[PDB]
Amino acid sequence: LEPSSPQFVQMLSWTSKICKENSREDALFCKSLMNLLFSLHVSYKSPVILLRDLSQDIHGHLGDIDQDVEVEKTNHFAIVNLRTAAPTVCLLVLSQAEKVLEEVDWLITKLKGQVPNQPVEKAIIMQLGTLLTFFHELVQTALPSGSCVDTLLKDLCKMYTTLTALVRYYLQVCQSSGGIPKNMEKLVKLSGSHLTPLCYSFISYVQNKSVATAMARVLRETKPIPNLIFAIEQYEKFLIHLSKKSKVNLMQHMKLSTSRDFKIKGNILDMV
């Protein structure tokens, strides 16, 4: 189908209507259906609203990490069931978000190599501000400790690297001393007050609750959390650079970075 017709629109409407209606136990059927829906919807507009209002429903079924929060589940999609949400849907929506970040980063590097930079900045800011609600929504979920949490950490590091690329571009632009409008200010303040502290609160839960190939597997585990911490600190450093350039300050909105120190117990005596 050519992606401009009443038939294309009605087909996409029909697939969305099924995805909003029924409940099915199989994980393969739902995953294929979601791939179909994203393949249709990715060429008619950006799916960044769908990811938000799908992960907001995912967040309901699993639960928060604080152990004392009364979620509402919002029943957006009936096909994202209890046995459906944990190992299948979250991994797929993370992959789709990674694709969206790839598109945004290509746009940023193209537009930085360009030097019509007035509306494209607004569009990129809109997409970042939308999917940051997605990330803030599924950070606090009590995801299974398998590969899904590792995928989430990798994609969150990718998100931060993209956002520092944007901040670097604004450093390259604000040599005119007036290139920090309100649409960036809301994005930076919201990123300060929604995503960054919740990253640390999530890392606490990830770390706290649990031959030679065993050693290789053990060393394979230790990468993503340091990679994420390095990306965050790089982000704050380049934000400090931008604040020093154009005489405004941005570190007012986001608090001081908390820090971690391992402890130990005398419970190894139980082992012997």
Partner: protein
């Protein structure tokens, strides 16, 4: 607007600094449109033989940008009904002055490698590298006649075309990104137009063109013996198109293209050779053309046919 040819005598003997020579080369760039089309190559020779002891990036950049802009304007306003229409300088003059100027630039680069190194570093690509143009592509293709710059320019061209096809495959895959940006001429059609434009009696780019075609075909052949396959298949298709296109237009080179294709396809290695076979079938469609030039390589290919396996 008449003594500019002798305006270069002021920068020959006396030492100067960068600011004044940059100002005078900016003036020269501004008056390229004013003077004439035909008078340019002697002025280019004078400025470029002056440029050894002074400014070297500015003159080359100005020439490249001016001729890219002129080619772009002529191409955009050339399209129309085959009837009376507005046009600037005709193709037969433009391609000839471009050929003389590119040959002069290649000679000057051969006189000192620093100019060539500056040119190569100037056109470095991931990034869009918007300075790429049919004129600049022809330039990079003609510098390959020097042994110092061959691989250093062919690898740049290869990565450039791969980046362009990746950009196309990314841009066609979404609506939002397709909604925001206007399309730019991707470098596939740029080279595919350079090869067609090369009919106008200059042959100093054919060797670079065939070498690029063979490199670009070999490096991205189907080695099956999924996303990155699509650029890796469009690249091979472009290579086949380029090779078949240079086969028909230019005569002196068609003896070696078929020899290389045969020498690369008649093997016992059992490596996947589908694309080379398709190219060979395409370029033996013009049967008499092969018989005129190279009717010997097929003969000793036939004499070796007894040894190969059945498939």
């Amino acid at each position: 607007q008449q003594y500019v040819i002798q305006l270069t005598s002021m920068f020959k003997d006396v030492p100067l600094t960068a600011e004044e020579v940059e100002f005078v080369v900016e003036k020269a760039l501004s008056m390229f449109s004013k003077m004439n089309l035909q008078e340019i190559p002697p002025l280019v020779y004078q400025l470029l033989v002056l440029s050894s002891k002074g400014s070297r990036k500015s003159v080359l950049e100005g020439i490249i940008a001016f001729f890219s802009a002129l080619d772009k304007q002529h191409n955009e306003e050339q399209s129309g009904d085959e009837l009376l229409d507005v046009v600037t300088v005709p193709s037969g003059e433009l391609r000839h002055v471009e050929g003389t100027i590119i040959l002069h630039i290649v000679f000057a680069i051969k006189l000192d490698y620093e100019l060539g190194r500056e040119l190569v570093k100037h056109l470095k690509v991931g990034d869009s590298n918007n300075n790429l143009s049919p004129f600049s592509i022809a330039l990079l293709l003609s510098v390959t006649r020097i042994q110092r710059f061959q691989d250093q320019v062919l690898d740049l061209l290869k990565t450039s075309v791969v980046k362009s096809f990746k950009d196309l495959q990314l841009l066609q895959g979404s609506k939002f990104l397709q909604n925001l940006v206007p399309h730019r001429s991707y470098v596939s059609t740029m080279i595919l137009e350079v090869v067609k434009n090369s009919v106008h009696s200059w042959d100093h780019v054919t060797q670079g063109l065939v070498e690029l075609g063979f490199i670009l075909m070999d490096s991205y052949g189907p080695k099956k013996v999924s996303l990155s396959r699509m650029p890796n298949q469009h690249a091979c298709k472009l290579g086949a198109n380029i090779l078949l296109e240079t086969f028909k237009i230019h005569e002196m080179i068609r003896q070696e293209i078929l020899e290389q294709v045969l020498n690369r396809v008649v093997t016992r290695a059992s490596s996947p050779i589908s694309h080379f076979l398709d190219l060979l079938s395409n370029i033996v469609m013009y049967a008499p053309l092969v018989l005129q030039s190279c009717s010997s390589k097929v003969t000793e290919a036939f004499d070796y046919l007894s040894f190969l396996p059945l498939q």
